Design a protein around this ligand. Structure first.
Ligand SMILES: *Cc1c(COP(=O)(O)O)cnc(C)c1O
Ligand SMILES: *Cc1c(COP(=O)(O)O)cnc(C)c1O
Lengths: 396, 396
């Protein structure tokens, strides 16, 4: 059966980490890591999370199966983080949430479920979008198309090209958005923008699906949701996929969730059942541990408070490198403008650099950057900034 | 989009636990639980697991993403538990293992991967088989057919009907087996039986896929694998799906794994890549926590030793109820033979009882049993045995 021909031509992971895992001089990391790193290059484990990890060592009584949808507390908790405080979408019971081996879990689960119950044929992702997007959905047998976004050149969102690319879409078509700023270039629709996508989105069909990892990394836990929230001001039907993998620095635990909305609660229920349908058919129920950490930090408001400050730290270091990058680059000699990298959000941004600068940087240079010129601001530490910036400007 | 018609007609879970969750007199549990219970009706959390849970509170340095295949230690460790000690299938590097949100995760992942790379069209499950089997594979677009097994009446494996039902199968068809004794009736092929399935299996085509949750519950960690192992003595190509969900009482953590075999290591590799392919496309990498517990107990041989004794306990309580069931039933008045329930293995066995005894037991009786007459020996405690056995014999 497996004997003769298969093999991968694979993901931009070992597509950079393994040459890094060998191409040893004093390698300026990959800026092609997918995780955050602190001022020392470590991707710590959090005080809010540990303290919470301990609350579980002691309080757990059984490792008894979780409900298909998971931890309801996590539920309440996730819902309220995405839609708000007195959110009339919560009291009103239009939203239902599933706990999933998070982020990708949710987009998958979202995928498999749309694929029946629904007659969604295509998914519109965005050029570029997080690399693993296409695979999730092709896997489920939905065809993926791309809308414009960052035509680049002038480093911002070619708003017009988007709207323009989008009109090709249609009524029962799902349009994938990243709530708060986009992997790989933290370029944001401003509220207005977010606002018109929504006006357009209702008058044309489009079930909107939010891909939401990164909340609290652009401006703040609650502002980051505004995009999700205005859409949500006017949808009836909407679906969002979340991850506490980045915001809780819980990467390996696999935490995130899938929220589904319907006009009303009866409808929400006939459909959530069918999303649970798709869950018993994937993995029968989600992994507790991560989410309990999660459910526990969001409930304990002392632990929340301590948790909100770490994230603040995160997000802040990230902001500090973005200026420093542009600064160390001034001083050292660059023929260009990159004042565009302090304008973007998140870990990611494309360093406007060529497939070949990117490659002239891994020879007698040593910096790892995935071929697309995309760097992870998070891998830049205050001291590695010197050499990095020598190297970047020694190619332009 | 979701508006009008969907809804579930669902899993034998709330299909029994929810009426239990309400039908309150002194309800004799459901014997329609899917988890083990101790002599008090609790599904504890283990000393081996806690001690290990603590080793992690203190030793974890980052929550950094796991490899797609997961924890390699878990790897080594799982492989050696399934195939053995000096296993020439390990040194020989024909086996490769993926860590997955376990058990169902693995059958799914196994499913999605067969579905391309391979030209497996059908899956042969067994009548009955674990209820969630059909959904996993239909979900992936493989058609499921059933082979005979327990025609019942004479409570044992209609060996002949199996062989007989099987011949309809064919060359690139996957045949699903439960390594050590079967959910819902712990009826075993003896080594010989296991042995002929294998002889047959090579001479006819059939990629064999083992569904293996329950190891150490029939006779012992190592004997339970004999079935897996003799097949494995002669396959080249074979695939097994595991779960430490029952044996480690880790139910909610989601621990298990998918082992794939090929004739040789080159071939194993072109295909594992494509199984990792299917993994980045499901959830991008598995949840650490559970498996670290797992990887940690199997390496630390003090913790292993302590772990092997709990399981022994488990398996033993399970054996003690099976005799007690048959005994309390003698004494109290039954018109039948049920000496067949001390012959079976595992938590499960069908109490030869009718859809209507099953139902005459939930009226002014109070015992919950999924309509198929299947009981979970594990929910029977030494004291609830009195009333249960009054009730069972008061209907025959
Ligand atoms: C980081 C990220 C994810 C993460 O999915 P998880 O399994 O939560 O790691 C998903 N989508 C996007 C756009 C991301 O940036
Ligand atoms: C219990 C059981 C499973 C469990 O899958 P998990 O997700 O590990 O709970 C799978 N298959 C069979 C036959 C089982 O009995």
């Amino acid at each position: 059966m497996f004997e003769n021909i298969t093999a991968a031509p694979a993901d931009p992971i070992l597509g950079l980490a393994d040459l890094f895992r060998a191409d040893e001089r004093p390698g300026k990391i990959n800026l092609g890591i997918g995780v955050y790193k602190d001022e020392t290059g470590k991707t710590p484990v959090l005080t809010s999370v540990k303290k919470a990890e301990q609350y579980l060592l002691e309080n757990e009584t059984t490792k008894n199966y979780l409900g298909i949808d998971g931890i309801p507390e996590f539920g309440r908790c996730t819902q309220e983080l995405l839609f708000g405080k007195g959110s009339a979408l919560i009291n009103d019971k239009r939203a239902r949430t599933a706990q999933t081996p998070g982020g990708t879990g949710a987009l998958r689960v979202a995928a498999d479920f749309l694929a029946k119950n629904t007659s969604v044929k295509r998914v519109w992702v965005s050029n570029p979008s997080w690399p693993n997007h296409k695979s999730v959905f092709n896997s489920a047998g939905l065809e993926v198309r791309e809308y414009a976004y960052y035509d680049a050149e002038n480093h911002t969102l070619d708003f017009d090209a988007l709207i323009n690319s989008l009109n090709e879409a249609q009524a029962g078509d799902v349009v994938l958005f990243h709530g708060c700023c986009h992997n790989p270039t933290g370029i944001d629709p401003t509220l207005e923008q977010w606002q018109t996508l929504a006006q357009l989105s209702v008058e044309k069909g489009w079930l909107p699906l939010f891909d939401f990892a990164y909340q609290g990394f652009a401006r703040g836990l609650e502002e980051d949701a505004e995009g999700l929230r205005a859409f949500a001001a006017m949808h009836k039907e909407l679906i969002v996929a979340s991850s506490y993998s980045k915001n809780f620095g819980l990467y390996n635990e696999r935490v995130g969730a899938c929220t589904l909305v319907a006009a009303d609660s009866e409808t929400v229920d006939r459909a959530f059942s069918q999303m649970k349908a798709a869950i018993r058919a994937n993995y029968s129920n989600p992994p507790a541990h991560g989410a309990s950490v999660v459910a526990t930090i969001l409930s304990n408001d002392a632990l929340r408070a301590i948790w909100e400050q770490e994230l603040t730290d995160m997000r802040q270091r990230i902001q500090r490198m973005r200026q420093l990058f542009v600064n160390t680059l001034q001083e050292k000699g660059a023929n260009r403008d990159f004042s565009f990298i302090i304008k973007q959000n998140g870990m990611f941004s494309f360093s406007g650099l060529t497939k070949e600068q990117v490659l002239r940087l891994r020879e007698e240079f040593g910096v790892y950057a995935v071929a697309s010129g995309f760097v992870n601001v998070a891998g830049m530490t205050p001291d590695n900034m010197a050499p990095l910036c020598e190297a970047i400007v020694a190619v332009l």
